[PDB]
């Protein structure tokens, strides 16, 4: 609490406030470009998956446990991004702990290993840096280690309900045995010779993975802007309190040094 210790703490807190303010301004520019990709993925999901709503496609009994896919990111500094995704998948795994988990990020794989390390069957790293595209969703669906041999296939992600907060939603994916066993599945002119049931079921997994990755990246970028604004605001309050302590210590150091020279010269 001297003059040298107060100067090092005030200079280090000022550099953290400038980095937090610059990161919040850069997050606002990236949110505008990510909003266009999220709007195109939401409109394409309502048209490509429109045949499943008119045919009433649903699952029934469990066949060899199930399959879970937790879509997230690999970096931090985004607030409660990794905590909300891990809490939603742990609540649904209580009634079926024998199902496999496929983590698509370093942040979701670290929290899931401390509670259910044996349930993790797949781990994907390097997807939270750049923006998602169709090449990243199509490569993870084809190498999911037999993804068509499960009755239920959930996709745990984070849905951005607003432009400030978010919530962890889930979307189910039907298999090849559940797409052809719908109620109004024979209403459309589908060819029985070629692959129509297995092709439409595998195409829904790659389409839902692209929509969950686009919505999860927009929710993580929006949550990172609120965390950067809160860190910059908290740094300003700490710099104001440190400036009042440094001003009182500077005046006390001048009075203590002048009293020592006046006492020695008067004796």
């Amino acid at each position: 609490a001297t003059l040298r210790e107060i100067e090092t703490r005030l200079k280090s807190i000022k550099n953290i406030e400038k980095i937090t303010n610059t990161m919040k301004v850069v997050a606002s520019t990236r949110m505008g470009r990510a909003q266009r990709a999220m709007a195109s993925s939401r409109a394409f999901r309502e048209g490509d998956s429109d045949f499943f709503a008119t045919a009433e496609t649903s699952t029934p009994e469990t066949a060899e446990k199930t399959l879970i896919i937790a879509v997230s990111s690999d970096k931090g500094l985004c607030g409660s991004i990794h905590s909300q995704i891990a809490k939603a998948t742990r609540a649904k795994l209580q009634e079926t702990p024998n199902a496999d988990v496929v983590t698509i990020g370093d942040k979701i794989k670290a929290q899931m290993l401390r509670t259910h390390s044996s349930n993790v069957v797949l781990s994907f790293n390097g997807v939270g840096k750049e923006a998602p595209t169709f090449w990243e969703a199509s490569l993870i669906a084809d190498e999911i280690r037999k993804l068509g041999d499960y009755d239920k296939i959930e996709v745990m992600y984070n849905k951005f309900v607003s432009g400030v907060a978010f919530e962890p939603s889930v979307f189910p994916s039907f298999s090849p045995i559940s797409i052809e066993e719908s109620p109004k599945l024979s209403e459309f002119e589908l060819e029985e010779d070629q692959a129509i049931p297995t092709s439409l079921s595998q195409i829904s997994l790659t389409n839902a993975i692209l929509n969950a990755m686009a919505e999860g990246y927009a929710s993580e970028i929006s949550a990172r802007r609120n965390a950067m604004d809160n860190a910059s605001k908290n740094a300003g309050e700490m710099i104001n309190k440190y400036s009042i302590l440094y001003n009182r210590t500077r005046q006390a150091v001048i009075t203590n040094e002048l009293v020592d020279i006046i006492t020695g010269a008067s004796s």
């Binding site: 394409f44 048209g47 429109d50 169709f134 459309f188 002119e189 589908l190 060819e191 389409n207 692209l210």
Partner: protein, 128 residues
């Protein structure tokens, strides 16, 4: 009334169309007013949607699924949708020559991928 929306941008979006001669999985079919509900897949052809008069846009679609709803709604969901003027004739000949030499020359999925790419490149070059 068409809803040709891709996975990156929307072309038709709102219902403001009449005819849509898009290539499906079978042949070169064309949606009229209130067509039957045929939710068939789309192949790599030319998706020319005739808007009222002769204002058809030659959109070279790479394939997808032309979903037809029962309420006179045609949702031609494809992967890519580029115009005919966005493909140069010089670069189109180089891709067809490389795919023909690589076909029936290796194994695994190298010969299977080269055979499907040679058929889509020959149909787009003849419709220029």
């Amino acid at each position: 009334k068409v809803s040709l929306v891709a996975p990156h941008q929307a072309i038709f979006t709102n219902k403001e169309v009449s005819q849509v001669n898009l290539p499906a999985s079978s042949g070169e079919m064309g949606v009229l007013a209130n067509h039957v509900p045929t939710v068939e897949e789309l192949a790599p052809g030319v998706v020319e949607v005739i808007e009222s008069s002769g204002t058809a846009s030659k959109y070279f679609v790479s394939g997808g699924f032309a979903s037809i709803l029962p309420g006179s709604k045609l949702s031609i969901s494809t992967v890519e949708a580029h115009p005919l003027d966005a493909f140069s004739s010089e670069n189109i000949k180089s891709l067809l020559a490389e795919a023909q030499k690589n076909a029936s020359s290796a194994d695994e999925t190298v010969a299977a991928e080269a055979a499907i790419e040679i058929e889509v490149l020959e149909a787009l070059q003849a419709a220029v």
